[PDB]
Structure 1
């Protein structure tokens, strides 16, 4: 099955998922001098005050924090989006070393990790229908750099010991995702895809310009998770990122000059 190893990693995915070589694949390098400022872009509207987190899960390739998406509790609107997108889950991609781990890059610079807040367009009724549509998902991407600790991340860090191996889950209620946001909501946006199989081309990407800082100790704890299930040989969950893909016939737009 697919993964991030030498024998099943990103360079092999096209054999099972031919869309890997498609026209709107993610992630991409953001060339800041080629991005086009678009004055028609609206500020993002992030309404997370009523978010209800439920559970944290190690799915074998990352850990997901899942939210109740049965009502318009935590929504994303505005920016390049039409309509209302509900938050369903967030997860991270990270590296084995501080100088790699993000999926998107900025002028070829890699960050230590990248946070993806995943939202789906409510006009399609459920997440499984949304992923079949070119405007089905909106993913907020936030870069992590190593520096000062992020207090709002510590509750996530402290539960990771309980979900070390694939398939483990733990109750994770009352987590407020507003503690993961940077001060500024300036962003780049482009049409893209999921960065894991099935690589569907259903994502409006919104990548925030301002990184958040996390401490070395916080990211070190991400690197203690395991790709494997319990009782299987230990494989550390590191470098679960896909490299940048060709931009092809797409323009990256910026909300700021």
Structure 2
């Protein structure tokens, strides 16, 4: 099945998922000079005070922090979005080295990692119906650079030893995703896709300009995770990023002047 290796990585995905070569694939490179400020963007609203985390799962590709999305509780709205999108999970992509790891790039610059907070449009009832729609999802993308530690990430780092291998999960209640956000909500936005199979073209991407800093020790613990299952040969979970895809007939808009 699919993965990030030589024989099952991003260059092979198109054979099972032809949309890999579609008209609005993600990630992309963000050319900061070509992005245009958009005065029609409404203020972005990230409302995570009642977020209710449940569980953290190693899915053999990344790890997901999963949320209870059964009530109206952790929502993203405003900016380019019409209506209200509800948080369902977050996950990361990261490298084997600090020089690479992010999926989006900024003027071809790769950050050490990238955080994706995934939300579905509540007009569609749940995530499964949302991913049948061109505006079903919104992903808030946040770059990570290596420098000072991010204190709000440490509860994630410390639980990773308990989910080292594919299929393992752990209770992960009361985690506050507000502690993962940078100061500024300045962002770039464009229409694109999920960045793993099935690569569905449902996503309004909102990529924050300001990275968060995490420590070298925090990212090193991400790289101790495994893609393999328990009792299988070790294949460290590193370089679980898809490279930038063709922009095609898209424009990237900036929320800032």
| Cα separation, 2, equivalents of 1:224 and 1:43 | 39
- Secondary structure of the residue aligned to 1:11 is coil
Q: Deviation at 1:57?
A: 0.3
Q: Provide the C-alpha distance between the structure 2 equivalents of 1:21 and 1:45, rounded to a whole number of angstroms.
A: 32
The equivalent of 1:182 in structure 2 is 182
State how far apart, in whole Å, the 1-side matches of 2:6 and 2:179 are: 36
**How much has 1:90 moved relative to structure 2?**
0.2
C-alpha distance in structure 1 between counterparts of 2:72 and 2:240, whole Å: 31
C-alpha deviation, 1:150, in angstroms: 0.3
Per the TM alignment, residue 40 of structure 1 is displaced from its structure 2 partner at its CA by 1.1
Q: Distance in 2 between matches of 1:114 and 1:51?
A: 21
Could you list the per-position Cα deviations for residues 129-188 of structure 1 after superposition, in whole angstroms to 9, with x for gaps in the alignment?
Answer: 101100000000000000000000000000000000000000000000000000000000
2:108 corresponds to which residue?
A: 108
Q: Distance in 2 between matches of 1:52 and 1:198?
A: 27
Q: Which runs of 5+ in 2 are unaligned?
A: none
**2:21 is matched with which residue?**
21
Q: State whether structure 2 residue 89 is matched by structure 1 residue 89.
A: yes
Question: Shift of the alpha carbon at 1:191?
Answer: 0.1
SS in 2 for 1:20: helix
Give the drift of 1:42: 1.4
Structure 1: stretches of 5+ with no match in the other structure: none
Deviation at 1:43, TM superposition (A): 1.7
Deviations 1:167-217 (A, max 9, x none): 000000000000000000000000000000000000000000000000000
Q: C-alpha displacement at 1:236, in angstroms?
A: 0.2
CA distance in 2, matches of 1:204, 1:153: 25
| TM-score using structure 1 length | 1.00
Query: 1:53 and 1:70 mapped to 2: Cα distance?
Result: 12
Aligned-CA RMSD value: 0.4
Cα displacement string for residues 91-150 of structure 1 (whole angstroms, at most 9, x for unaligned residues): 000000000000000000000000000000001001001011000000000000000000
- SS of 2:11's partner is helix
Q: Distance in 2 between matches of 1:45 and 1:224?
A: 35
